[model samples]
Target chain A: SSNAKIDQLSSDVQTLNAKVDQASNDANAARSDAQAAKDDAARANQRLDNMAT
Target chain B: SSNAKIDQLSSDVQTLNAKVDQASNDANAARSDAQAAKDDAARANQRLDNMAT
Candidate 1:
């Protein structure tokens, strides 16, 4: 019984590790998306400024 | 010995669970940041379009 429990727990850990890896990837992608959006906003503002000048 | 190993495994699982929770929060925050940045970019683009018209 104890061995079986250990096996189950080990499996759970592996699943959680995989989840963590996926979350890390998701977070990184989100950060990249945010950065690109920010760049777009900046460029738009710059263009507006140029028009004013 | 089996019981001890089980205990250790249980502890490990708990730690991993915490890590998973933190990673989830980080991912959520990143997603929010990305959304906000996208909104900002859209608004800036709108302003530029208004100026062009």
Candidate 2:
């Protein structure tokens, strides 16, 4: 059953590849959220500075 | 060269597994950054509210 084992491994590889792709997408989304949050923080700080003046 | 191909495929799978691990780590790091940024924004907003009062 060497061929069968090979077939199973091949399938596993494909599944792993899909997971890798999903992980990449998740990372990208998280980074985007981080950037948006940073921008919000910056704007809030600016408002605080303006109030002081 | 069936065995050779299988060896290559096995190596590919290992590499893919490593990539998946790295991707998970990256995603986790990014989420942490996002959370930190969100906290900063919230604090800034709170300060603005305090100033208004």
Candidate 3:
């Protein structure tokens, strides 16, 4: 209700920051995995030239 | 610094949180695009069965 709640608010903010950082890391890793998948697909597409049709 | 610095720190944390959120969203979009690329490649590979070589 007042400045007395400042510490608790700060702590809560810090905790949320931690969670946000973790999500950011996970999202970054997911992006990397997706990039790898795309690369694999590109490689496969290159083989299309060797196909009969 | 003192506990009085809590508000300023919270503001800074909020700004950082914003940047992190942006990064997270960008990473997710990239991931989805990558997935789409992979799916396209998979479909291309399937056509391999009809290929000559």
Best-fitting candidate, scored by TM-score: 2
Per-residue C-alpha lDDT of model 3 across residues A1-53, encoded as one tens digit per residue: 45657767777777877877787877777788777878787778876766436
| Candidate 1 global lDDT | 0.86
By lDDT, the better pick of 1 and 3 is 1
What C-alpha lDDT values do all the predictions have?
0.86, 0.84, 0.74
Ten-residue region with minimum lDDT total, candidate 1 chain B: B44-53
Q: Model 2: how far is A10 from its true place, Å?
A: 0.5
Give candidate 3's TM-score: 0.71
Candidate 1 C-alpha lDDT tens digits along B3-52:
98798879889898998989888898888889888888988898778875
- lDDT at position A3, candidate 3: 61
Clash counts per candidate, in order, are: 0, 0, 4
The weakest ten consecutive residues by lDDT in model 2 chain A span A44-53
Better of 1 and 3 by TM-score: 1
Model 2 chain B worst lDDT run, 10 consecutive residues: B44-53
Better of 1 and 2 by TM-score: 2
* RMSD versus native structure for model 3: 3.2
